[PDB]
Amino acid sequence: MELSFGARAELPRIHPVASKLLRLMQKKETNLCLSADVSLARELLQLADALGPSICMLKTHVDILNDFTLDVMKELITLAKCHEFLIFEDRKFADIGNTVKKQYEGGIFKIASWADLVNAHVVPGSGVVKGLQEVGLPLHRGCLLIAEMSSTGSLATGDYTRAAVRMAEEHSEFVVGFISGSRVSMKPEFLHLTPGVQLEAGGDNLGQQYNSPQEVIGKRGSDIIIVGRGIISAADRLEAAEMYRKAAWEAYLSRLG
Amino acid sequence: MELSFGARAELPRIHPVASKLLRLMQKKETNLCLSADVSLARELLQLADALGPSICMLKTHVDILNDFTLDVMKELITLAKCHEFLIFEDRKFADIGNTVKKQYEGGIFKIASWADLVNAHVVPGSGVVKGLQEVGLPLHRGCLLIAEMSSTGSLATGDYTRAAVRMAEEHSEFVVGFISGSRVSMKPEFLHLTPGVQLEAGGDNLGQQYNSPQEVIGKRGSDIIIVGRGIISAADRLEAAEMYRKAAWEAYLSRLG
Numbered sequence: 285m286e287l288s289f290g291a292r293a294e295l296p297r298i299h300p301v302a303s304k305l306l307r308l309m310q311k312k313e314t315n316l317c318l319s320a321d322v323s324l325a326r327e328l329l330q331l332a333d334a335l336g337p338s339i340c341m342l343k344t345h346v347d348i349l350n351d352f353t354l355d356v357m358k359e360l361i362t363l364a365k366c367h368e369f370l371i372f373e374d375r376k377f378a379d380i381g382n383t384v385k386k387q388y389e390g391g392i393f394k395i396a397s398w399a400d401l402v403n404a405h406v407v408p409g410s411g412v413v414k415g416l417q418e419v420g421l422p423l424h425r426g427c428l429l430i431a432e433m434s435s436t437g438s439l440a441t442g443d444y445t446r447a448a449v450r451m452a453e454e455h456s457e458f459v460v461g462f463i464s465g466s467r468v469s470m471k472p473e474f475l476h477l478t479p480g481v482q483l484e485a486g487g488d489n490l491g492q493q494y495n496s497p498q499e500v501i502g503k504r505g506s507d508i509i510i511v512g513r514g515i516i517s518a519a520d521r522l523e524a525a526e527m528y529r530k531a532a533w534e535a536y537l538s539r540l541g
Numbered sequence: 542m543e544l545s546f547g548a549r550a551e552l553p554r555i556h557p558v559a560s561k562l563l564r565l566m567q568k569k570e571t572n573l574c575l576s577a578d579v580s581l582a583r584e585l586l587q588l589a590d591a592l593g594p595s596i597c598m599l600k601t602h603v604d605i606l607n608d609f610t611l612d613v614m615k616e617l618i619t620l621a622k623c624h625e626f627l628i629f630e631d632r633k634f635a636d637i638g639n640t641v642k643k644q645y646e647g648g649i650f651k652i653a654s655w656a657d658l659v660n661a662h663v664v665p666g667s668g669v670v671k672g673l674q675e676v677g678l679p680l681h682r683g684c685l686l687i688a689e690m691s692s693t694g695s696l697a698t699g700d701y702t703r704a705a706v707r708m709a710e711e712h713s714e715f716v717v718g719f720i721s722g723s724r725v726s727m728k729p730e731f732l733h734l735t736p737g738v739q740l741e742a743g744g745d746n747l748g749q750q751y752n753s754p755q756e757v758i759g760k761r762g763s764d765i766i767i768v769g770r771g772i773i774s775a776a777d778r779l780e781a782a783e784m785y786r787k788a789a790w791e792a793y794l795s796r797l798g
């Protein structure tokens with residue numbers, strides 16, 4: 285009784301942001317999230333424009349953009365609306381609730397004003413979610429909880445992962461899913477997004493480890509692949525994005541049967 | 542064989558940043574870190590100037606400063622040098638190594654350029670430290686690892702805390718200590734800094750829980766108290782800082798015997 289993305293978008297308990305995402309995934313035949321890990325606004329925007337049709341989501345690290353301004357994020361929103369993808373700021377909120385609400389709403393980045401999705405580590409306990417949701421619920425935003433990590437030595441295992449799932453399922457008015465290496469929740473309303481993905485085997489020299497789209501979508505049951513360098517470092521980033529999209533989409537179709 | 546702060550500053554394996562901190566703690570009779578949780582640069586700087594003589598450290602959240610510029614941080618450095626305190630950016634790095642090195646060096650905040658200390662969560666595994674130290678070692682900086690958290694539901698317990706201690710003790714050329722609620726390492730070269738501190742019992746409505754300076758320095762064996770609202774929300778922040786300084790300093794003296 286695995287449902288398609290389009291049917292999951294209609295589930296009774298679906299969050300509106302998840303529904304919007306699932307609908308555009310189905311419409312565009314993409315379950316690829318581009319990790320736009322660049323330092324220049326122009327490169328960010330040129331990638332978003334060219335790759336927008338191929339992606340369901342663009343994941344940012346706003347704090348590595350040397351020339352960040354709120355206008356850049358307005359331009360990114362225009363592209364997200366045009367090409368139909370969500371913006372996910374990979375901020376990894378990880379503080380007490382009182383602090384994260386200010387980090388989400390305020391400062392120079394004003395993340396909540398432009399990010400459809402953010403993520404949080406669960407290590408502080410559920411106050412991290414409660415603090416974020418005070419800003420994010422009124423702004424109709426969603427959050428992803430980090431249930432597992434791709435890096436060598438990750439401590440997000442075992443009871444830690446189980447705690448992340450419980451925290452999500454108790455905050456389902458705001459939490460729409462997980463960053464994880466596999467399916468961690470059996471509830472189909474929750475999205476599973478998986479980083480540490482490349483077509484070829486390997487890793488990096490700072491603890492990143494890679495698995496293929498077929499492995500993480502098809503065997504491990506995740507929904508969306510998050511891909512940075514496998515695309516970004518390629519010469520033709522559009523063709524690279526298409527190869528990752530086709531890989532992740534077929535793996536989804538073949539699991540769905 | 543508990544050593545004074547001044548003697549710890551001379552230990553063979555001490556990190557230079559820890560040594561500088563311990564020396565100024567001893568000189569100024571302060572083991573108070575102000576958590577300068579404000580949104581205005583002028584308030585940040587006015588607090589740093591007035592409270593500088595009373596503190597060993599000023600902890601920032603640069604990402605909640607509505608009017609951040611690098612010039613503000615230059616002015617903060619002037620005050621830190623004048624009054625003799627270290628600047629700790631409480632960024633809670635918590636990503637893979639390749640990402641955190643860019644978040645530490647780059648973007649609009651250029652944290653490594655002005656922060657003596659930063660901190661990191663250990664959940665990604667030791668690549669988080671390796672990535673930071675690539676930037677921080679050449680810049681003669683130090684890092685604190687989050688071994689425990691003060692908030693309700695914290696998952697930084699048990700084997701997670703032990704993993705943080707091991708990670709610190711294997712990266713001692715860069716890691717100078719811990720954020721923790723108590724002493725977690727028996728090695729006197731490592732600093733223990735404890736948030737969740739107020740003179741009165743209680744908490745906040747988003748999971749913060751408080752213990753007193755006497756409890757965390759005197760019974761729990763920590764070195765430094767980190768205090769935000771207990772000072773910041775008081776009318777006279779200078780007198781409040783002095784009350785916290787005297788509390789933490791006496792608790793240290795009485796444990797030292």
Ligand SMILES: O=c1[nH]c(=O)c2[nH+]cn([C@@H]3O[C@H](COP(=O)(O)O)[C@@H](O)[C@H]3O)c2[nH]1
Binds near residue numbers: 433479480510511514
């Ligand atoms: O929440 C997360 N949990 C993880 O386990 C994880 N692994 C990688 N990352 C982030 O994803 C991107 C990976 O980029 P690459 O494809 O270039 O290695 C980069 O932007 C990384 O910061 C993670 N984020």
Ligand SMILES: O=c1[nH]c(=O)c2[nH+]cn([C@@H]3O[C@H](COP(=O)(O)O)[C@@H](O)[C@H]3O)c2[nH]1
Binds near residue numbers: 690
């Ligand atoms: O690394 C950390 N581990 C913790 O357990 C913890 N508890 C509180 N905080 C931070 O410290 C400050 C506490 O501020 P208050 O005194 O106002 O509650 C605020 O700036 C908080 O962000 C922590 N940081």
Ligand code: PRO
Binds near residue numbers: 290291294
């Ligand atoms: O028509 C559609 O696209 C959706 C998919 C599931 C049922 N209705």
Ligand code: PRO
Binds near residue numbers: 547548551
């Ligand atoms: O003279 C001092 O201040 C240091 C303290 C320990 C021994 N020497």
